[PDB]
Amino acid sequence: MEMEKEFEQIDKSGSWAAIYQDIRHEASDFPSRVAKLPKNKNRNRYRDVSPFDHSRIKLHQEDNDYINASLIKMEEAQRSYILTQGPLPNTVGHFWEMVWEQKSRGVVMLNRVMEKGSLKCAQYWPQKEEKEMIFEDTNLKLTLISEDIKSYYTVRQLELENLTTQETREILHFHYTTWPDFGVPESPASFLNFLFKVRESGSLSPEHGPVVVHCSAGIGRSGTFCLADTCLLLMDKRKDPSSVDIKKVLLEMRKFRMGLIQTADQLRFSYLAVIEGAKFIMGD
Numbered sequence: 001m002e003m004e005k006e007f008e009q010i011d012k013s014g015s016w017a018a019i020y021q022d023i024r025h026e027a028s029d030f031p032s033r034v035a036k037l038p039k040n041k042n043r044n045r046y047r048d049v050s051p052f053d054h055s056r057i058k059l060h061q062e063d064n065d066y067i068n069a070s071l072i073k074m075e076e077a078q079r080s081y082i083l084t085q086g087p088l089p090n091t092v093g094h095f096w097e098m099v100w101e102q103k104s105r106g107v108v109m110l111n112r113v114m115e116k117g118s119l120k121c122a123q124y125w126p127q128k129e130e131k132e133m134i135f136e137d138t139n140l141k142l143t144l145i146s147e148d149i150k151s152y153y154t155v156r157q158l159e160l161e162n163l164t165t166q167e168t169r170e171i172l173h174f175h176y177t178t179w180p181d182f183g184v185p186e187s188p189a190s191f192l193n194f195l196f197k198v199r200e201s202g203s204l205s206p207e208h209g210p211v212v213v214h215c216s217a218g219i220g221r222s223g224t225f226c227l228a229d230t231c232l233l234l235m236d237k238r239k240d241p242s243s244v245d246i247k248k249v250l251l252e253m254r255k256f257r258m259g260l261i262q263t264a265d266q267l268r269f270s271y272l273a274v275i276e277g278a279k280f281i282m283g284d
């Protein structure tokens with residue numbers, strides 16, 4: 001059923017809450033035993049958001065391999081994403097270790113460091129060229145190379161150095177800075193343009209490791225970003241674009257990380273994103 005019609009049918013009936021609860025009821029439940037070990041309590045931002053054991057990213061160290069991060073592998077679309085929480089004061093070095101070990105080209109940030117008067121994630125990248133950051137626990141150095149500030153997002157070039165081998169890599173930081181403190185954006189235009197700027201960069205392409213995507217918990221805004229990208233890729237690839245079922249794609253992604261899309265308003269915004277995506281590409 002053409003999703004644009006399914007959309008108007010749900011909107012006219014005001015059933016967004018009912019659709020959303022159906023998804024919550026059918027979603028996968030897999031064990032997260034490593035996340036709940038007592039040694040890992042200060043590595044988790046939220047007690048109710050954990051990576052599944054089967055899909056968690058492992059750090060390459062014998063001490064403790066745990067990070068709150070999941071590999072979302074979309075087989076038909078041929079895309080992979082790592083979805084993670086915003087880094088904590090004691091996990092900023094783990095975060096950059098993961099970016100290094102997984103060969104990621106891009107980091108996508110969908111939150112501000114402070115929102116609603118509270119800290120949503122650590123200040124994990126340098127704000128001035130001449131004041132670099134060293135992570136002594138993981139032996140990494142991070143330098144700000146350049147910054148391009150636009151009305152709805154900022155792009156930064158960063159240099160990550162493995163201090164053990166003196167190898168360096170260029171990491172691109174895509175920072176969406178205008179998601180409102182409450183609810184979802186009124187139009188998906190600036191979000192879709194952000195997604196197009198991440199695509200343009202090569203960060204989502206198979207020649208690199210998976211993109212790292214985060215917000216505060218790494219399930220809500222982060223869920224919306226990967227769901228819209230995968231749905232628009234499938235509508236490009238298939239003979240029948242109208243066959244793409246956004247509820248079935250979301251349930252596939254929920255096999256790999258719990259809780260993706262946190263509210264009925266985020267579900268409606270994701271539909272609007274794909275629906276409005278398909279025009280400007282296909283019809284007018």
Ligand SMILES: CCOC(=O)Nc1cccc(Cl)c1
Nearest residue numbers: 195196232235236277278281
């Ligand atoms: C066949 C459907 O494919 C799309 O609608 N692609 C698309 C549209 C707008 C923005 C961006 Cl980033 C991608």
